[PDB]
Amino acid sequence: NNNLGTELDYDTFCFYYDWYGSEAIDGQYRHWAHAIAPDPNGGSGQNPGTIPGTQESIASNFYPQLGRYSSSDPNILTKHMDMFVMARTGVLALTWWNEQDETEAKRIGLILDAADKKKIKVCFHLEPYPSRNVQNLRENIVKLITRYGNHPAFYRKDGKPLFFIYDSYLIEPSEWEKLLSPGGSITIRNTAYDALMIGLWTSSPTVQRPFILNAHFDGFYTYFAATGFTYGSTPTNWVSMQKWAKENGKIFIPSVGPGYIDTRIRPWNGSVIRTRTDGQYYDAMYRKAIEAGVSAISITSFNEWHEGSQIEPAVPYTSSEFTYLDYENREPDYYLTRTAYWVGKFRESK
Numbered sequence: 001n002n003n004l005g006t007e008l009d010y011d012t013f014c015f016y017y018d019w020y021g022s023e024a025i026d027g028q029y030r031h032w033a034h035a036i037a038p039d040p041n042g043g044s045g046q047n048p049g050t051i052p053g054t055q056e057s058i059a060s061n062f063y064p065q066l067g068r069y070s071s072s073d074p075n076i077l078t079k080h081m082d083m084f085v086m087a088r089t090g091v092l093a094l095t096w097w098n099e100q101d102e103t104e105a106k107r108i109g110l111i112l113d114a115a116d117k118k119k120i121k122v123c124f125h126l127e128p129y130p131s132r133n134v135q136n137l138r139e140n141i142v143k144l145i146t147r148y149g150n151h152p153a154f155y156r157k158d159g160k161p162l163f164f165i166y167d168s169y170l171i172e173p174s175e176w177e178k179l180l181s182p183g184g185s186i187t188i189r190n191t192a193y194d195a196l197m198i199g200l201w202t203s204s205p206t207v208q209r210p211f212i213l214n215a216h217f218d219g220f221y222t223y224f225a226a227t228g229f230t231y232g233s234t235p236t237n238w239v240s241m242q243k244w245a246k247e248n249g250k251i252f253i254p255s256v257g258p259g260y261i262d263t264r265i266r267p268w269n270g271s272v273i274r275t276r277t278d279g280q281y282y283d284a285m286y287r288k289a290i291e292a293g294v295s296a297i298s299i300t301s302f303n304e305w306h307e308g309s310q311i312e313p314a315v316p317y318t319s320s321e322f323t324y325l326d327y328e329n330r331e332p333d334y335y336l337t338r339t340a341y342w343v344g345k346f347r348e349s350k
């Protein structure tokens with residue numbers, strides 16, 4: 001029955017990426033090495049090349065305290081779960097790409113096991129995998145609930161699993177309705193595979209309100225850590241988004257993050273940079289979410305190192321190939337402990 005102000009919050013979801021590899025464990029320094037994206041407005045014949053994922057040159061503007069780690073290393077996973085405990089983030093929202101490979105399956109099991117040791121829960125963030133559609137989504141939801149639903153770390157809210165659906169707008173509401181209306185042709189409602197389905201609110205209310213209603217989503221999130229990147233990721237809209245959610249029986253889970261920078265992998269994307277300012281950016285965004293009066297908050301991200309949105313500890317590093325950004329006047333674990341601060345403020349408000 002403790003009341004220490006240190007406990008995990010199970011309405012706080014932190015987006016987690018399990019796609020990092022090491023040569024030793026995975027055969028390649030996966031994701032630390034990454035293709036550089038061509039400029040979509042830069043014309044033909046670009047040869048942007050690749051970041052090689054050497055110790056000196058990784059696919060991030062920051063540098064992990066844990067180095068070029070493997071997401072399959074149980075010892076890294078232990079450390080990450082201890083970081084979630086420090087942050088008070090009770091739910092790990094795991095990227096899920098439907099890779100259909102044994103190394104994926106192994107990783108997911110390792111993450112569930114490590115999470116449970118620290119009473120962390122896991123939900124899935126369903127990514128835009130090839131030919132994703134409501135039929136294979138249903139099949140995959142069935143598979144995930146069947147495989148993992150009895151694992152003690154599998155997240156439930158009032159008895160239901162929860163999924164975040166990235167880029168949900170890539171599927172028409174008429175298709176979503178088949179899966180998510182109680183009357184839908186292939187409904188999950190009232191079945192063993194029912195779940196809270198949280199779609200991505202992107203653009204203006206004139207588009208998103210009917211999308212969400214007609215698709216029969218249970219709620220919506222915003223993902224992007226960069227303020228103003230979309231209507232949904234503009235925090236001054238969050239009070240009105242929450243009002244609409246409450247009026248329509250939907251769960252709004254705004255996404256907050258500490259900054260954004262992706263110019264190692266997208267050199268042309270500098271206008272999306274959002275400076276961390278020693279934590280002031282994160283504070284401002286988190287405060288807006290709490291002030292909007294929401295029931296749940298998502299954090300972009302634990303470890304999306306390519307996009308510079310991570311709260312995972314980063315260290316100063318200057319190599320012969322790149323001078324990395326770092327947490328400046330703040331210590332490496334600052335964003336974990338600042339997350340814990342905001343989780344406490346959120347709980348005080350709840």
Ligand SMILES: OC[C@H]1O[C@H](O[C@H]2[C@@H](O)[C@H](O)[C@@H](CO)O[C@@H]2O)[C@@H](O)[C@@H](O)[C@@H]1O
Nearest residue numbers: 167202224225226229230266269272307
């Ligand atoms: O700024 C780049 C942006 O790229 C990716 O987002 C793309 C797509 O998935 C989003 O739905 C739309 C929203 O308007 O933007 C892009 O086309 C993500 O990797 C994102 O975090 C990143 O900022």
Ligand SMILES: OC[C@H]1OCC[C@@H](O[C@H]2O[C@H](CO)[C@@H](O)[C@H](O)[C@@H]2O)[C@@H]1O
Nearest residue numbers: 015095125127128166223265304306307
């Ligand atoms: O988890 C939702 C999205 O989060 C942002 C990253 C995005 O993946 C794309 O971008 C990354 C680079 O940041 C690439 O490594 C991926 O292959 C993908 O293009 C997630 O979908």
